[PDB]
Design an enzyme around this catalytic site. Structure first.
Site, PDB file in Angstrom:
ATOM      1  CG  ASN A 205       1.839   9.283  -6.899  1.00  0.00           C
ATOM      2  OD1 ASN A 205       2.773   9.556  -6.118  1.00  0.00           O
ATOM      3  ND2 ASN A 205       1.253  10.210  -7.655  1.00  0.00           N
ATOM      4  CE  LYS A 206       0.010   3.763 -11.325  1.00  0.00           C
ATOM      5  NZ  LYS A 206       0.961   4.724 -11.888  1.00  0.00           N
ATOM      6  CG  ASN A 207      -2.430   0.230  -4.471  1.00  0.00           C
ATOM      7  OD1 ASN A 207      -2.576   1.442  -4.726  1.00  0.00           O
ATOM      8  ND2 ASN A 207      -3.453  -0.576  -4.163  1.00  0.00           N
TER       9      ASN A 207
END
Lengths: 378, 378
Positions: A181-183
């Protein structure tokens, strides 16, 4: 219309081919890809030593251990965070201490942080919630004045800057997550940025059972390490993501601008839905976090989220206040102790924000939020 | 001739294609693949609940926690194992107690195990070294008589049997590893087999921060859990490996047979190179472990391994005795306490064994071992 989740990764065919190559090679766990990824992250951080791991949780714990944190020590953090942020303090034997948030930024309030320092404090874990840094100059002025180590919980802040310098290139010990879910993702993973090579060697020991191998048959264990090494499959995904970082951050800033433009003048804004700070220089816009005006709604947050889902829109909660969880109540925490974090934790909802979204998707989300506020608002 | 490593995975194109599909789907961490993998493993284990994790080390630690192991408790294990076996005991606050190995099987001596039981003993961690089970009937007779929990370190024993019953389908808490080098891989990963659904729920809590989510916005933490969930990418690899299990195990058995036939009567055997037990029913032949007759060699083990490398053959050490490591010497351990494990730990060498090996490779390895013993024997 298709369902719109609140996040989705963006993994190109070049990166997928890279993973295929790794699997066909037979060199699938920690190896040359991890070496290359550590080198790339180190150069990103201005040449500082970097070690990669199988999450951005163990990096926090290992940071604390490098800082000498253990039984009898206090570590200050925020209750408005994922629970690992304080659980890692407990894991070391130390005592978690909370400080309330600033309701505008949703980050730890630096005056409240200073007020929580005691003669037992040894380290601070600020959280960059949504990827938004705190005032880094003030943070380190406090740390310097009180002779405290800082383990930055930059889980969400890969690509964030503070007045032109990268999170990771400044500060003390810096922890990143590469969760899906991180960038930037490695599927699951993380990194710890160190000050020097001695800290990096200690980090390596904690990464895999405290084991050092020498020559053909030399082996010793001098540290109670864990099981935290990253696979080369995962590292290859990170290497494939890195060249897109600038573009991803720009895309997310454009989407955030689109959100503010779409919300302006609508039923949600009028009812009192609370928007994040509208700044486009420092944060990497990892999430778009809003607060519901619960006292002005005839539905609960859960019902609000259900109504979003009925309209085909996924939402999340980042995060309920940690200190009201059963484990923390048993440590002696209660309601009323951190009123800003408690109000935030009860009212926050995460709206969709990911690089493949269009302006149309943003308008769809805001339409749904407006429609629900119009129908169910007092 | 090309270099022969001591192991190499065998990952097919259907499996690689599967990983491609997972990555393209955007559902890359824990999800439907992990659910399907847990179901497949449960079936393999006769319907017992199974939970999967990001290693076969955290599964040991979680098994101890499920068994109520903590400060003041003793847990008995073997010094002839990877250090995580005893490090997980220390992690819980409990005290590791070692019992010596049987020099013939290289596994924990069950009589020495029984001799080490005190009123503080709470659990036992037998290791199935090379994938070879201990006498499972005697193991559980001991456990029942002393009201002890058993956390089986079956890291290496996926596909092993006892009297025709599967390791995993029998016993108490059973821990498997799916590391790259294991007979079935998920790149990195593991599994814990439980007795009942209450144990499985507790395992789930320990797997990810003690967090339970309910509905749209319910969240609580009631256990100090860690960061141990498996990715869907990894689970998809395990699902692709499972249909090959019987064939892989048969291939390894045939290679082990070929080693015995090749060694029979040669210079290495005459000098005193010690071979593993020649049985082809229970163990899954994860490794082929030999001991060097160091008192009959003019070279060290390290020099023996270097000479093997000069001949294009990779080798390993599984394993030096744990209790002689720095961390364990600081707990009061010393030479002479576990003579069989010490002699084994100093003299063991791991020879190539993996499914893509040929009979010719086996003969190449044995030729090299014979040649070195002929040259440097005394």
């Amino acid at each position: 219309a298709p369902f719109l989740p609140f996040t989705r990764p963006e993994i190109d065919e070049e990166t997928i081919q890279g993973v295929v190559e790794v699997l066909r090679s037979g060199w699938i766990t920690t190896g040359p890809q991890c070496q290359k990824f550590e080198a790339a992250l180190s150069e990103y951080c201005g040449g500082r030593p970097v070690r990669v791991f199988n999450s951005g949780t163990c990096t926090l714990e290992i940071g604390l251990r490098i800082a000498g944190v253990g039984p009898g020590d206090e570590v200050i953090t925020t209750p408005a965070s994922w629970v690992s942020t304080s659980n890692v303090i407990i894991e070391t034997g130390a005592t978690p201490v909370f400080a309330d948030i600033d309701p505008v930024t949703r980050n730890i309030d630096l005056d409240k942080l200073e007020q929580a320092i005691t003669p037992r404090t040894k380290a601070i874990i600020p959280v960059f919630l949504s990827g938004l840094p705190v005032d880094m100059d003030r943070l380190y002025a406090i740390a310097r004045a009180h002779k405290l180590r800082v383990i930055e919980d930059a889980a969400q802040a890969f690509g964030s800057t503070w007045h032109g310098k990268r999170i990771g290139a400044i500060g003390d010990l810096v922890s990143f997550s590469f969760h899906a879910n991180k960038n930037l993702t490695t599927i699951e993973g993380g990194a710890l940025v160190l000050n020097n090579e001695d800290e990096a060697v200690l980090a390596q020991k904690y990464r895999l059972q405290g084991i050092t191998r020498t020559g053909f048959d030399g082996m010793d264990c001098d540290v109670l390490g864990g099981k935290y090494n990253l696979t080369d499959v995962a590292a290859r995904v990170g290497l494939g993501q890195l060249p897109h970082l600038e573009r991803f951050t720009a895309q997310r800033r454009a989407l955030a601008r689109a959100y503010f433009a779409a919300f302006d003048g609508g039923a949600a804004a009028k009812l009192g839905v609370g928007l994040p700070v509208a700044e486009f220089e420092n944060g990497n816009w990892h999430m778009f976090l809003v607060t519901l005006p619960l006292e002005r709604l005839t539905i609960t947050r859960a019902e609000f989220m259900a109504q979003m889902k009925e309209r085909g829109i996924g939402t999340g909660i980042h995060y309920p206040a940690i200190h009201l969880f059963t484990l923390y109540r048993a440590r002696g925490f209660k309601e009323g102790m951190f009123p800003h974090a408690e109000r935030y934790g009860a009212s926050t909802v995460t709206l969709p924000l990911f690089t493949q979204m269009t302006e149309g998707d943003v308008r769809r989300v805001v339409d749904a939020v407006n429609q629900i506020c119009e129908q169910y608002g007092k």
